[PDB]
Design an enzyme around this catalytic site. Structure first.
Site, PDB file in Angstrom:
ATOM      1  N   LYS C 154      65.615 106.085  19.053  1.00 40.51           N
ATOM      2  CA  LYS C 154      64.437 106.829  19.481  1.00 40.51           C
ATOM      3  C   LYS C 154      64.284 106.787  20.990  1.00 40.51           C
ATOM      4  O   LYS C 154      64.110 107.823  21.635  1.00 40.51           O
ATOM      5  CB  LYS C 154      63.186 106.261  18.827  1.00 40.51           C
ATOM      6  CG  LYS C 154      63.031 106.581  17.384  1.00 40.51           C
ATOM      7  CD  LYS C 154      61.643 106.238  16.923  1.00 40.51           C
ATOM      8  CE  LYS C 154      61.308 104.790  17.181  1.00 40.51           C
ATOM      9  NZ  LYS C 154      62.395 103.882  16.761  1.00 40.51           N
ATOM     10  N   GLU C 180      54.593  99.981  23.417  1.00 42.36           N
ATOM     11  CA  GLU C 180      55.985  99.580  23.298  1.00 42.36           C
ATOM     12  C   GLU C 180      56.362  98.712  24.489  1.00 42.36           C
ATOM     13  O   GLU C 180      55.618  98.601  25.463  1.00 42.36           O
ATOM     14  CB  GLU C 180      56.914 100.790  23.189  1.00 42.36           C
ATOM     15  CG  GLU C 180      57.017 101.345  21.781  1.00 42.36           C
ATOM     16  CD  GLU C 180      57.642 100.363  20.810  1.00 42.36           C
ATOM     17  OE1 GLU C 180      58.091  99.293  21.260  1.00 42.36           O
ATOM     18  OE2 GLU C 180      57.682 100.653  19.598  1.00 42.36           O
ATOM     19  N   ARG C 181      57.538  98.099  24.395  1.00 42.50           N
ATOM     20  CA  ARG C 181      57.919  97.005  25.279  1.00 42.50           C
ATOM     21  C   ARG C 181      57.592  97.317  26.730  1.00 42.50           C
ATOM     22  O   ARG C 181      57.717  98.457  27.177  1.00 42.50           O
ATOM     23  CB  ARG C 181      59.412  96.729  25.141  1.00 42.50           C
ATOM     24  CG  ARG C 181      59.847  96.325  23.758  1.00 42.50           C
ATOM     25  CD  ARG C 181      61.347  96.383  23.641  1.00 42.50           C
ATOM     26  NE  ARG C 181      61.798  96.191  22.273  1.00 42.50           N
ATOM     27  CZ  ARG C 181      61.589  97.056  21.290  1.00 42.50           C
ATOM     28  NH1 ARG C 181      60.941  98.183  21.515  1.00 42.50           N
ATOM     29  NH2 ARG C 181      62.040  96.795  20.076  1.00 42.50           N
TER      30      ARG C 181
HETATM   31  N1  LIG Z   1      73.285 107.488  22.306  1.00 44.84           N
HETATM   32  C1  LIG Z   1      73.656 106.205  22.112  1.00 44.84           C
HETATM   33  N2  LIG Z   1      74.899 105.769  22.387  1.00 44.84           N
HETATM   34  C2  LIG Z   1      75.272 104.493  22.194  1.00 44.84           C
HETATM   35  N3  LIG Z   1      74.439 103.558  21.718  1.00 44.84           N
HETATM   36  C3  LIG Z   1      73.166 103.859  21.404  1.00 44.84           C
HETATM   37  C4  LIG Z   1      72.698 105.229  21.585  1.00 44.84           C
HETATM   38  N4  LIG Z   1      71.420 105.260  21.205  1.00 44.84           N
HETATM   39  C5  LIG Z   1      71.089 104.013  20.805  1.00 44.84           C
HETATM   40  N5  LIG Z   1      72.133 103.182  20.922  1.00 44.84           N
HETATM   41  C6  LIG Z   1      72.114 101.750  20.583  1.00 44.84           C
HETATM   42  O1  LIG Z   1      71.060 101.506  19.662  1.00 44.84           O
HETATM   43  C7  LIG Z   1      70.033 100.726  20.267  1.00 44.84           C
HETATM   44  C8  LIG Z   1      68.672 101.289  19.904  1.00 44.84           C
HETATM   45  O2  LIG Z   1      67.747 101.036  20.949  1.00 44.84           O
HETATM   46  P1  LIG Z   1      66.635 102.107  21.356  1.00 44.84           P
HETATM   47  O3  LIG Z   1      66.982 103.431  20.755  1.00 44.84           O
HETATM   48  O4  LIG Z   1      66.549 102.014  22.849  1.00 44.84           O
HETATM   49  O5  LIG Z   1      65.237 101.581  20.769  1.00 44.84           O
HETATM   50  P2  LIG Z   1      64.563 102.117  19.416  1.00 44.84           P
HETATM   51  O6  LIG Z   1      64.536 100.929  18.503  1.00 44.84           O
HETATM   52  O7  LIG Z   1      63.206 102.584  19.857  1.00 44.84           O
HETATM   53  O8  LIG Z   1      65.471 103.205  18.936  1.00 44.84           O
HETATM   54  C9  LIG Z   1      70.298 100.765  21.752  1.00 44.84           C
HETATM   55  O9  LIG Z   1      69.929  99.545  22.388  1.00 44.84           O
HETATM   56  C10 LIG Z   1      71.781 100.984  21.836  1.00 44.84           C
HETATM   57  O10 LIG Z   1      72.460  99.729  21.835  1.00 44.84           O
HETATM   58 MG   LIG Z   2      61.780 102.028  21.406  1.00 49.56          MG
END
Ligand SMILES: Nc1ncnc2c1ncn2[C@@H]1O[C@H](COP(=O)(O)OP(=O)(O)O)[C@@H](O)[C@H]1O
Ligand SMILES: [Mg+2]
Ligand SMILES: Nc1ncnc2c1ncn2[C@@H]1O[C@H](COP(=O)(O)OP(=O)(O)OP(=O)(O)O)[C@@H](O)[C@H]1O
Ligand SMILES: Nc1ncnc2c1ncn2[C@@H]1O[C@H](COP(=O)(O)OP(=O)(O)O)[C@@H](O)[C@H]1O
Ligand SMILES: [Mg+2]
Lengths: 467, 486, 469
Positions: C154, C180-181
């Site tokens: 997200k 959120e964080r």
């Molecule tokens: N487009 C992407 N490419 C590679 N890794 C991803 C991608 N999107 C998310 N991730 C991985 O999944 C994790 C999900 O974190 P994030 O999306 O920032 O928080 P949330 O829990 O709100 O989705 C990320 O820290 C990353 O390691």
């Molecule tokens: Mg998030």
């Protein structure tokens, strides 16, 4: 004495008497309504207040309206003039056909017949339907589940049971449509009028219809079963005969009780059902018995929520059922009517002591052969028919002939089949199935058995279909 | 000071005013606050009154003065509403001026009894093949449309509404159907795009859109279905035919639950009060088909329910499934594999049945139903396909064609005669020699062809309402000739 | 007027007044605090008492303290001066650069546009993401949702959307971070400053951050959404210009209400949520809309508690969006990023009239082939895959190729993947999926499509794998 409505919360009205309270379960008449609103007492809150549940909509109730204590529980007319008349829970006629004229009035909150009044010999009501009377016999003063929804012959079967019991026993019938769709209620009324069980002209109707419609407050759908039971109890005690009591549906009864209990403010039980589910079912189901004057035999359409046979509602209901009849679509497709499923249908009195040794052995023979044919149908569908022994093929022939023989023509479904209706007495059915099983009729064609009454009639058909 | 015709707010908060006074206020009566705000008196208690505010409680201080209007809630009615967009109380919200309706009705009137009705017998044409043939809907029925998210329920409703334009633009008067679309708990922009869509198809000259959107206070969303049902009972009780679409009936239940839990009534299952059956039953039981002594009018209903994860054993889905005369499941698994409308024809039913089908559609759909029933019980093999006899092979080669006939597109309902022609071609067997992927094209071609040249045959089917053996032979000839040159 | 505190229970404070009573939603300032504590009135309990929710920690409150009724709901600065700043729920800055000096103040509570004020136009909004553009195209002026479990993408996806669109946008933008964080809020602030979107020296900033991060007591997390929404409201109406509004997360706006609900004296609803969940969310989501006098392209991230899309909160939100892209944990486990679920993301402009016949046909073809593959996997479970017919092994191979091709490397994920972020205009996506469906790439391995932009790059990658083989 007159009290004053003090509170009105949804369908729950709190009234305040000043001289003396009415005992629980009395009926109170609210003064000032165009229609007749009846409140049934439910609690004694103290300070001369009583909390009550309304039988009709409580829109327009002012805080102060005068409420007259009738003096006894809801009282309905229970003469023999009810027959052919629709009435609602408070006993008014809802077919706009004129008042129900009777000399008797019955209070719908009665008690189960005492232990001394109970009859101890377990008889067998003869419905005149071969399948019902052979594999899953009905018992006088017993409860009978009826599974199967729509499109299978539930209404036609109900009408046939009504007709046969009114014809082969002289006993009338009551139909308590708890939670009844208005469309379905009107359709049932007109089907009955067409089929003759109800008659609008010559005072020879065999059914008393009671309808608690689906748009009435819960306090009125939880009591209509008791109105039906009151009419039938009259026909049993004050006219000493057998009675049929159809209850469509029995799940909506427990649901209505659950909503009433929630409205009053009682902690919901296991799965949201009222804490008093067991005794709410008991007080009703325990007045359907065979006392020493007569018997009420109840046929209770059953709905199983979520296809869950351990749900508290069916679990509580099945503790009372004395038999089960399972209408199945898979047998209306095959053209056999009534659709009663010979194997799912069961009964408590399939016991050599109750029904007898010859009846019992014939029933078990038919069940065994039908189970064997069910098992062999798979092998016929897999490895082919040509690889079955002579005995296997003979059992297949016998099973198909028995299947076709279970079908019967109903006097009320003449306009569908055209065949004149038949009422097969018990002994004739036992004889026919004894003969078919022993092999006496291995030399007749299958279609000679489809939609025939006694076996001798099947023989007559077999002759007439080769001439 | 007056404490019979007037009272003063003891408390307010979360939309539930607690008023003191109003000793002569009736239950379910419409009181008015000093701030131009209305409210409905639901809880009459010995010491106070529980008023639900039709709007924002920001304007309801403590100590405000509340005056009873003396009347139960009532809504305008008439053909003066047709083509308008009204809110849960009759106020226009389309900014086309006042409404100008002479009559009024009470929202909480009771349904017709058992004698006034008559068995449902006319067909209510939805213009959707899968519905009009396999799960028919009569006039006076209550046919739940129950489905998941984004499966196509609102589209079924809007196709139904758009289809009636052919009848409403004709001169036959007992086929005219007036539509009402109650939109409960919906983003206003959704309702605006829907009104635009209805205008595009010119289906907004006989439609009344009742709008109780997400921002509206809980009582308005609780009350919108009853407003719509009253505006529809007006047409029922005047020899006219109506069709009311509640969308959804689960959000009315949510709003009612909110009011109850804020009035502190005993929760019950899923926190729904004990009246979420009475609430919906005393609404859906107003869809009737009056006999001739009462005008002969009718009022169909198509409540829409959303089920979370195809769970139809939840509280409200089962409450509304045990009240209605059928149900049209809309599964998403079928939606994404090409079957649109995604009407699962296994679970769908209509307890009215073929009693509400035109004799032609009866003639054809009677056998189409059985063909699909047979196909559905050997569907699993479809993958294996080979290694099986010619019996099941032909079964599931007919089933695939029949299925691909029932596909249909947005906002393009078909006249009954054209549905009959297409299903006739498909089921009589003039398509089993055709690659399934092309079937749709054939349809979209054949249809047009028949529309152009053989209009007389379609007119005869439409008027006679039956496929006479003369018409049957002519149709067979047409199908054979066209299929030859494809 | 001036009241006095009478009871403090958690974040819920009762205040007793002797002068006139303050209407609901008013803001009352507690006198005698080192830092501004604002209580937003929420109930009138009778006896000139009001129950209120403290916008900031109620540590060290004393029964009898004095409270002054401000006289109007929480008013926040607005105007083109809030651009580039950071704001609380109560609007006072939290980026340590002096006061936000504006002429305009706005009350965060205001009714929604009437039905006669809505727009009905829809034009696809190309985002440069293959899956989003192909199966669930966004729309200018529409509300957009990203339904995710925990840790599915997200926030990375919303940062990608910011990077892409906010940088190439004529109008302004707003990012309301609800609960959120704080690490993420600081990360975003520094990313914008380092990317020029925010500008500390001069007045050339296009983003007005607002933050209610998860250390704020529930009274604050439940309102900061309204504050960011008020800033966006102003930019939509007074500036008469287009606006973007990213909210992350919009679940916390519901969770905070649930947290305070019980203490407010409300019986709990189905899953412990407040009884007023649906309306407390409608009164908010109905102000985030395009109108005839402006346009907001709102994007919202939405937590889905325990990946349960049938939970009351996401279930209720689904009805308030013009387009949903349901990120999935199962797809993210296969390494496909973004994890968008092709068979659960929907849209309202996915019609043959609004996006064109060929786009629609290709999108439906992708969905149908993926669904067929889903059905086949059940058989492949038992038979093995060598037993499959030859019309289905093709289906499975094509479906795997399409699954891989839906993945893409973002410019904000270079830290994770190392690859280079790409933008794929709409035509490349439609053409590439047309070709993959038609069979023009049965000769390339499926891994040739993993994390590439246009189709030609997949061809080049296949060639490079072959050469290095
Ligand atoms: N487009 C992407 N490419 C590679 N890794 C991803 C991608 N999107 C998310 N991730 C991985 O999944 C994790 C999900 O974190 P994030 O999306 O920032 O928080 P949330 O829990 O709100 O989705 C990320 O820290 C990353 O390691
Ligand atoms: Mg998030
Ligand atoms: N017959 C059909 N043919 C093709 N597509 C359809 C059809 N019916 C619906 N759809 C598509 O399904 C999507 C959802 O449609 P619709 O709004 O009718 O579902 P819904 O259940 O009303 O959604 P919600 O539950 O969010 O209100 C739309 O984008 C529409 O294009
Ligand atoms: N013994 C029978 N003979 C002929 N038709 C029957 C018989 N039993 C049932 N049917 C047919 O099955 C259908 C089932 O309808 P019915 O039983 O009357 O209502 P429901 O389906 O609600 O029980 C009837 O229309 C009837 O034509
Ligand atoms: Mg919809």
């Amino acid at each position: 004495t007159t009290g004053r409505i003090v509170a009105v919360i949804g369908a729950v009205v709190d009234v305040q008497f000043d001289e003396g309270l009415p005992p629980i379960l009395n009926a109170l008449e609210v003064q000032g309504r165009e229609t007749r609103l009846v409140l049934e007492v439910a609690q004694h809150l103290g300070e001369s207040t009583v909390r009550t549940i309304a039988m009709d909509g409580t829109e327009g109730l002012v805080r102060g309206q005068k409420v007259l204590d009738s003096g006894a529980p809801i009282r309905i007319p229970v003469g023999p003039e009810t027959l052919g008349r629709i009435m609602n829970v408070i006993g008014e006629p809802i077919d706009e056909r004129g008042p129900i004229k009777t000399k008797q009035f019955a209070a719908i909150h009665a008690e189960a017949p005492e232990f001394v009044e109970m009859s101890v010999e377990q008889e067998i009501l003869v419905t005149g339907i071969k399948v019902v009377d052979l594999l899953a016999p009905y018992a006088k003063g017993g409860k009978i589940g009826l599974f199967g929804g729509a499109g299978v012959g539930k209404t036609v079967l109900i009408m046939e049971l009504i007709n046969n019991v009114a014809k082969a026993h002289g006993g009338y019938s009551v139909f308590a449509g708890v939670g009844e769709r208005t469309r379905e209620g009107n359709d049932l009324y007109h089907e009955m009028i067409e089929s003759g069980v109800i008659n609008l002209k010559d005072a020879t109707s065999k059914v008393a219809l009671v309808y608690g419609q689906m748009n009435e407050p819960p306090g009125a759908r939880a009591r209509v079963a008791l109105t039906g039971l009151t009419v039938a109890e009259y026909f049993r005690d004050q006219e000493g005969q057998d009675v049929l009591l159809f209850i469509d549906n029995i799940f909506r009864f427990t649901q209505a009780g659950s909503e009433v209990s929630a409205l009053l403010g009682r902690i919901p039980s296991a799965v949201g059902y009222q804490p008093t589910l067991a005794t709410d079912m008991g007080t009703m189901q325990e007045r359907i018995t065979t006392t020493k004057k007569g018997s009420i035999t109840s046929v209770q359409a059953i709905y199983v929520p979520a296809d869950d046979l351990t749900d508290p509602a069916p679990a509580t209901t099945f503790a009372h059922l004395d038999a089960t009849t399972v209408l199945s679509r898979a047998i209306a497709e095959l053209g056999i009517y009534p659709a009663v499923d010979p194997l799912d249908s069961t009964s408590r009195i399939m016991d050599p002591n109750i029904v007898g040794s010859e009846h019992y052995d014939v029933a078990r023979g038919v069940q065994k052969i039908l189970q064997d044919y069910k098992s062999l149908q798979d092998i016929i569908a897999i490895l082919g028919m040509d690889e079955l022994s002579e005995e296997d093929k003979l059992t297949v022939s016998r099973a198909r002939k028995i299947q076709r023989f279970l079908s019967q023509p109903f006097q009320v479904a003449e306009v569908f089949t055209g065949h004149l209706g038949k009422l097969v007495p018990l002994k004739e059915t036992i004889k026919g199935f004894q003969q078919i099983l022993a092999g006496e009729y291995d030399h007749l064609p299958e279609q000679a058995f489809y939609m025939v009454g006694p076996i001798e009639e099947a023989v007559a058909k077999a002759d007439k279909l080769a001439e | 000071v007056d404490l019979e015709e007037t009272g003063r707010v003891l408390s307010i908060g979360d939309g539930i005013a607690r008023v003191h006074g109003l000793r002569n206020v009736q239950a379910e009566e419409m009181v008015e606050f000093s701030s131009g705000l209305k409210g409905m008196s639901l809880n009459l208690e010995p010491d106070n009154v529980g008023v639900v505010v039709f709007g924002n409680d920001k304007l309801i201080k403590e100590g405000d003065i509340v005056k009873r209007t003396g009347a139960i809630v009532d809504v305008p009615v008439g053909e003066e509403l047709l083509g308008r967009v009204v809110d849960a109380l009759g106020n226009a919200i389309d900014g086309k001026g006042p409404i100008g309706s002479k009559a009024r009705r009470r929202v909480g009137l009771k349904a017709p009894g058992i004698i006034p009705r008559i068995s449902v017998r006319e067909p209510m044409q939805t213009g959707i093949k899968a519905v009009d043939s396999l799960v028919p809907i009569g006039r006076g029925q209550r046919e739940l449309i129950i489905g998941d998210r984004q499966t196509g329920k609102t589209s079924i409703a809007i196709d139904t509404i758009i289809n009636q334009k052919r009848f409403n633009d004709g001169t036959d008067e007992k086929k005219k159907l007036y539509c009402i679309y109650v939109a409960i708990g919906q983003k206003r922009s959704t309702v605006a795009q829907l009104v635009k869509r209805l205008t595009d198809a010119d289906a907004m000259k006989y439609t009344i859109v009742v709008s109780a959107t997400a921002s509206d206070a809980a009582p308005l969303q609780y009350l919108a279905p009853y407003s719509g049902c009253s505006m529809g009972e007006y047409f029922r009780d005047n020899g006219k035919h109506a069709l009311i679409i509640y969308d959804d009936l689960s959000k009315q239940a949510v709003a009612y639950r909110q009011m109850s839990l804020l009035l502190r009534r005993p929760p019950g299952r899923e926190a729904y009060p004990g009246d979420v059956f009475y609430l919906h039953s005393r609404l859906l039981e107003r869809a009737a088909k009056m006999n001739d002594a009462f005008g002969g009018g009718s009022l169909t209903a198509l409540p829409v329910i959303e089920t979370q994860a195809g769970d139809v054993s939840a509280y409200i889905p089962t409450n509304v499934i045990s009240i209605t005369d059928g149900q049209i499941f809309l599964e998403t698994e079928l939606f994404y594999k090409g079957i649109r409308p995604a009407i699962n024809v296994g679970l769908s039913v209509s307890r009215v049945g073929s009693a509400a089908q035109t004799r032609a559609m009866k003639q054809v759909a009677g056998t189409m139903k059985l063909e699909l029933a047979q196909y559905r019980e050997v569907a699993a093999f479809a993958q294996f396909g080979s290694d099986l006899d010619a019996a099941t092979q032909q079964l599931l080669s007919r089933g695939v064609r029949l299925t691909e006939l029932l596909k249909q597109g947005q906002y393009s309902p078909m006249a009954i005669e054209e549905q009959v022609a297409v299903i006739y071609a498909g089921v009589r067997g003039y398509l089993d020699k055709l690659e399934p992927s092309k079937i749709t094209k054939f349809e979209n071609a054949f249809l047009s062809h028949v529309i152009s040249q053989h209009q007389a045959l379609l007119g005869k089917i439409r008027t006679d309402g039956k496929i006479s053996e003369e018409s049957d032979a002519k149709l067979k000839e047409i199908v054979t000739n066209f299929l030859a040159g494809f």
